Symmetry: D3
Subunit: 253 residues, 6 copies
């Protein structure tokens, strides 16, 4: 029966303003979550965190963006590595799901050779052709790989049900990135779990006391938060914020 | 035709408000507005902050004054300064709006014969804003039943007010959903590119800053590059929106 | 359970309901709906505002020359629910077909209720055109303490509880964000609340066009969309303003 | 030097409500204008009025719709016949412009053997596949002819300049019909002339005291009227309404 | 309990290039599939192959297009006749579904007097007003009949469930034609069956070794195939290609 | 201003790659590119195949060479031919791109001061192509971080490079998503319509052929009829994109 495991590729060191827009220039540190869903029909990885290469050579693999987001992580936190130790070989992953293609969410891409990769077309298309302000958050060595099998979702695909049994559904949440998606999970014992990912970094974002410090569209981002508000109230879901260093320890990790 | 660059005083805020994530230090900006006198009629662009802000900013603007504190004198109100200049309110043919933010709707409905020209989507957004931008829209300024509006559509980019290339709307979405800059052509100066809030300062123009308040980052930076191409094509003189350093260097 | 209420009637002419059909006086019921659900009570629209029972001219304004509301104070949706056994705090959702004046009596009268309507109806209600502005009562729907869920273009079929009990069925045309509702109840089975997508059997049978509408193309295609839905589901079809059909239904 | 000639193919007999929505069932008669532009680069016909077949067999050529719109016209009023009488043979018309493809505006279609027919793509497409409420207003025998050379304009073609010299321009005015276009004309002596056609049936529609009694979108219709308000104010144009039995005799015919 | 019957209206003789783009002028022959679903709630015909008139007088009914696609079929293969030999009379068909409105998929249109015809709106509208390169492929004698009851699906209707029980669902696959739809079926014993129709002529098309030889959009056609890949991989569906002379005998 | 029509040798391919489904015969086409010398600065359009193809085709283009074999000398490289003509690489103000296919990106980035103008949707498609078109996009040409781009938007049709009617973008989608033709106005010659790949040959122009490589057939044929109307209106001299019979009849 299906289960949800919450992992973390270490942390990112940045400023408060990168998380909470115009909030200040103090140092600040955030977890990098990623998720595994074990399912009778196959295992699912969501995003995979920062690329394992960041544990050894961040400046070489990410480049100048490291002056903004410094990744603090060990080699064994790499998604492939963490999974091997957990007992799942890279070949035993049926799906990689992507909320979006930012640099702390593409560690899984191409690392699971049998996995279909599911993401919004417009995220893939923006990733390949970013604007200058966001070009550094997209690592082509992660997501630009000819060997990858992609399922690129269209605008009408909101709610896409990965297995067709309501276990995992994409919940489109544009704004933080053009093709950003959250996920609604339904587990037999826990019930519904809402993975906001970067549609709501922190409880302050969810409560409309902060704007994301990086974003493609503020108009979409705040409407997407309210869309999640309605979804959380309808389902009673447990809400998991994308990058909340105060709430992250309170969940099952 | 002539272009007069007035200013409705200044705004006191933080640096982050103008340059996103750039710090919390105190910062002050001019609030431009513009007069074009034309043989076919006078044109006011935006008109600055409402004159009521000179007396009672908290009463007229409300909570938003905790972010943007307006410093102006009554003399600076756009009706008053134009009255003291020889221009009677009835003697204004057009009011043009870059957008309907609070420091750009001082002229709205104060000129009783003016057709008010703005993008439809700015007008619609102004009437139904999201929570993060609602404070910056003052309904007392733009929500007046008596106003004659021409609401531009998406195909209207480049709209030529007189049909003679003196004043054209240059759509620059991003800072607000219906934000527009303006390209002026004057007999002697030639082309003047009024960036307004598409490019607050030279740092934004040089892609060293993002706006601290914005509807869409994607649109805003693409709109700046649109202006780059227009400036390079025309040789226009580029007037930034709220630049304390560059503003004194213009004929004011 | 579904309970079908009404807030009195409206007095108009036949042509306001069946376009171009005559100036004879005409009277129509104003339905509104209550769904009792184990997970929470649902109010659809709520009829004309209760303020209309006392001071119609004062509350609705000039539009009373077109639509005169005739209702008692006890027909107000709060009052009628209290009489029924349901206090205003015991209402989890208010659903809006659209935001015309005879459909916003419930807005903001239920302090814990999430209000669900198409975003494009909310936005049009805030910035309407001159022909429809009188049909949108800002005193009803423009309350800043109201909690909205504004549905997007892809949310057609939105399932309020997640259990096929109540679904939005987008039916643009009569208003830009008009929605009908498809209900499924255990004993009755499917019930299709057309609301203003089809005022009467004449509209449903394509012998009439609505006497007020934003788009005729959308309005007729929305009726045919309902035709297919009725035919697929076998639903009981409830017309929105039909004086002959309305007494034949079960009323609270 | 270019000139504008305002013709008419008789009248239509209907009810007041067909012209001014919901304004009563009284009997009502309207002129059916069409226009000829003389130009050094060629002759231009706008719409051409009702098909000359309506002067003889209205019920046979139009059908059931004659119970709503009864055409009163003589045979010599057909656009081919009146142009011959005037001095122009059918082969000497270079452009047929269509405001829209309603039955009283397709008398010219395919009657001019060398003319390019210019109309909005979306008007042409809707005319081929209308809805039930408007199917009777589109006469397939007029506009569905395989010999006709069409230039179908797209949405970005607003302002289209037929000759390239500001003499005749399409002014898109959706609402009455999906692809309805008005025309802005500039003549050497008269200056600007605004042909509203069916964007503004009468002065009453222009002053926003009436709505069209037949229309595809009220929202587009009133916004298109206000678009024409702005154009008339900007240019000083003489405004010619499309079916105004009180204002029509006040123009040069 | 529902069943899928796979029929055929003879073949089409054409060139290979008509089926696999730029693959050669060699002669080629392809089956013309069509489908019947028997369902407790009614019988459903999908497309219905070529018109029966093609068995008698091809040139007279199709016109010049018979120079590209020659139909070889017998009058008993006409969809009304082959159903009359199976167990069902024309009046006992509740729904006619259309993948698109090309000549080899409009044999059923208007032949079943009570059948609601379900197709994408944009297919119906394109068929009424096609471009020159494709007009010959649309036979107005088949689909332009005023007696036909149409349900015209909109863009948001992807997934449309005919009966509301997952037996037959429209799977939008634009590209071969603007309004082209494939079908996902679920049968009690067989499980999921994916009718690709003309979104994937052959297994070369499925395997991205061939583009369609006739198409409206190549971009949409290839993205539609990849969308079917994802559907096939998720459901384990049996994939039925639309015009494959080799694989077609492997089916029942 | 003057127009000079150059060519980077030829392409060897099949007939069908040019005229769809028209056969597997050997075929050769010229590869035009254009220079406009203008008082306000020189303009290169496209620039032909990259000069690297004259030395190492298989190395620079890869597998696509099995479809399009390029036959050119180093001297034909756009930078080389311009030097020999008297124009150094620095003396090019603008590089215009019809589209970003391999035979039209020879100039990209070879002129260090040149603003590069192309449709946004072409630049975006080139960066993320589908499998059938990925071969035709050469990253080594257009994916250069140093290049200064002006990316035209959907409303920019008719874009006027110098603002004096000499060179205008004429959007012609279909052969590629963001393909554009160009209408030139020269003082002595009058109008010149560079169709580029919107009309390979006179047979495409005359609607006796479809292009052998295609993003959208619907757009491509409508773009050809758009060019028809433009040529009829202006009397333009019509230059086809890859026509081996017509190309010698023009001034080279
Ligand atoms: Ni992110
Ligand atoms: Ni992140
Ligand atoms: Ni602003
Ligand atoms: Ni400002
Ligand atoms: Ni209503
Ligand atoms: Ni109502
Ligand atoms: Ni009309
Ligand atoms: Ni008319
Ligand atoms: Ni087909
Ligand atoms: Ni077929
Ligand atoms: Ni090409
Ligand atoms: Ni080429």
């Amino acid at each position: 029966a299906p289960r949800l495991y919450m992992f973390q590729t270490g942390t990112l060191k940045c400023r408060v303003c990168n998380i909470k827009m115009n909030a200040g220039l103090d140092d600040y540190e955030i977890p990098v979550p990623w998720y595994l869903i074990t399912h009778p029909k196959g295992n699912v990885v969501i995003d995979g965190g920062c690329a394992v290469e960041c544990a050894s050579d961040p400046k070489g693999y990410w480049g100048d963006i490291t002056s903004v987001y410094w990744p603090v992580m060990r080699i064994e936190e790499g998604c492939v590595q963490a999974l091997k130790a957990f007992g799942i070989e890279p070949a035993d992953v049926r799906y990689v799901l992507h909320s979006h293609l930012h640099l702390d969410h593409t560690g899984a891409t191409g690392r699971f050779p049998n996995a279909i990769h599911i993401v919004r077309r417009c995220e893939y298309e923006y990733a390949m052709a970013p604007d200058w302000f966001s070009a550094g958050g997209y690592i082509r060595a992660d997501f630009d790989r000819p060997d990858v099998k992609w399922h690129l979702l269209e605008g009408h695909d909101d709610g896409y049900d990965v297995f067709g049994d309501d276990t995992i559904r994409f919940i489109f949440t544009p704004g933080h990135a053009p093709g950003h998606s959250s996920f609604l999970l339904r587990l037999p014992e826990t019930g519904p779990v809402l993975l906001a990912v970067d549609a709501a970094y922190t409880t302050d974002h969810w409560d409309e006391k902060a704007l994301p410090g990086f974003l493609a569209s503020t108009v979409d981002a705040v409407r997407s938060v309210r869309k999640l508000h309605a979804l959380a109230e309808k389902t009673g879901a447990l809400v998991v914020y994308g990058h909340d260093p105060e709430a992250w320890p309170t969940f099952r990790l």
